[PDB]
Amino acid sequence: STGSATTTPIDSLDDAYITPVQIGTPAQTLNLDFDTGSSDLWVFSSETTASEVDGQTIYTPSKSTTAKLLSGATWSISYGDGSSSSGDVYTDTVSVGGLTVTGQAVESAKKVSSSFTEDSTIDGLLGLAFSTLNTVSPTQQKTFFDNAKASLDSPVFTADLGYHAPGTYNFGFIDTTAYTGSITYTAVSTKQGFWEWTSTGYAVGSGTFKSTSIDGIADTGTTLLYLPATVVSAYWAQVSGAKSSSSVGGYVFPCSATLPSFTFGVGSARIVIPGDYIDFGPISTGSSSCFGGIQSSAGIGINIFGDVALKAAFVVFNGATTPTLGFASK
Ligand SMILES: NC[C@H]1O[C@@H](CC(=O)NCc2ccccn2)[C@H](O)[C@@H]1O
Numbered sequence: 001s002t003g004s005a006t007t008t009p010i011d012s013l014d015d016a017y018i019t020p021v022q023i024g025t026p027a028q029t030l031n032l033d034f035d036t037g038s039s040d041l042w043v044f045s046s047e048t049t050a051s052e053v054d055g056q057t058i059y060t061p062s063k064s065t066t067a068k069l070l071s072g073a074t075w076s077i078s079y080g081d082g083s084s085s086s087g088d089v090y091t092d093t094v095s096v097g098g099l100t101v102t103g104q105a106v107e108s109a110k111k112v113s114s115s116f117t118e119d120s121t122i123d124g125l126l127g128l129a130f131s132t133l134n135t136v137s138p139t140q141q142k143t144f145f146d147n148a149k150a151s152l153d154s155p156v157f158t159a160d161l162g163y164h165a166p167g168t169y170n171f172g173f174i175d176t177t178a179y180t181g182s183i184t185y186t187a188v189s190t191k192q193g194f195w196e197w198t199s200t201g202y203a204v205g206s207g208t209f210k211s212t213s214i215d216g217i218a219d220t221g222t223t224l225l226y227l228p229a230t231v232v233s234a235y236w237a238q239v240s241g242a243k244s245s246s247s248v249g250g251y252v253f254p255c256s257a258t259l260p261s262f263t264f265g266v267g268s269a270r271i272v273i274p275g276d277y278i279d280f281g282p283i284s285t286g287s288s289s290c291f292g293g294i295q296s297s298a299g300i301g302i303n304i305f306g307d308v309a310l311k312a313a314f315v316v317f318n319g320a321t322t323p324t325l326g327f328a329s330k
Contacts, residue, residue, distance in 0.1 A: 001151045002172035003099025010121040013280050015223050019169055022095040024064030030057050030123035035221030036195055039133035039143050040077050042107035043124035052112050055120030067092045075107045075136045085112040089136055099171050101148050105141035133193035155319045159220055161311035163277055179314035179328035184269035188323045197325050204235050205260030216303030218325055225308040226297040235294050248283050251292040266327040273312040
């Protein structure tokens with residue numbers, strides 16, 4: 001089997017991407033944030049505290065003939081940005097782009113934090129990291145990908161995120177028309193439950209490539225590119241007027257600037273992030289100070305190749321017995 005679904009930016013800045021997902025019988029379609037940095041599939045639901053729902057589409061398990069309460073199971077997750085959610089668990093039929101999994105754990109939110117409430121466009125998350133990170137207790141549950149894997153033509157999914165444009169998540173096959181040149185594959189460590197890999201270095205604009213190992217995770221659920229302070233300082237030094245602002249919470253730059261590209265290494269291959277991918281617009285409405293798309297990982301504990309990096313590439317998440325990651329230009 002295979003699946004193919006279009007993923008769409010939630011706003012004009014590509015702050016996140018949503019992908020339609022069919023849950024239950026008859027189908028209830030929710031727009032979920034596919035997140036390769038976490039491993040829970042959770043949704044706004046008929047069980048979510050009323051005051052914490054503001055415009056989201058909810059899952060109502062009582063209206064699904066295939067929904068079954070997973071007795072005694074609860075879940076609770078907190079993300080790197082401090083957001084969080086929790087609730088109980090159903091199993092139900094879940095389909096993504098024509099690919100169907102029966103008995104998928106669908107985690108129903110009873111509580112969500114304010115940032116989820118305030119985002120009317122995201123109805124929940126679909127985790128695509130390794131199932132070892134799944135928070136369901138007392139019996140850990142598998143991700144959609146892990147459940148589907150055996151049935152897929154090939155045990156892979158691919159992320160093809162657009163810049164200010166729709167893109168595609170494919171499951172079970174590699175669309176050879178969706179990228180240019182070749183796909184370069186690189187080793188993955190699953191020791192922390194992430195798609196963790198080591199970049200071979202970087203360049204700023206037309207500058208010389210710096211060969212240096214940068215360990216980090218491929219995370220579709222993170223907006224920006226978070227890299228070591230040395231690397232990030234070298235980037236923003238090439239932008240006149242750019243500075244790190246503690247009040248704003250990162251590097252900002254004059255909105256009149258032209259941003260240089262940023263290149264990262266994948267083995268001997270190179271992925272080039274165009275400068276305008278790194279522009280996340282005015283820090284507040286009407287401001288002439290703009291927020292940068294490359295930020296320091298110093299306060300995070302990990303480097304994160306988020307959407308800013310990934311949308312410059314066609315990315316293969318290879319879930320073979322020994323997982324690997326593939327990157328191609330496009
Ligand atoms: N500290 C490492 C962990 O932090 C995550 C980064 C994060 O929170 N991104 C934003 C975000 C918000 C809401 C939902 C999903 N992502 C990584 O995926 C790891 O899991």
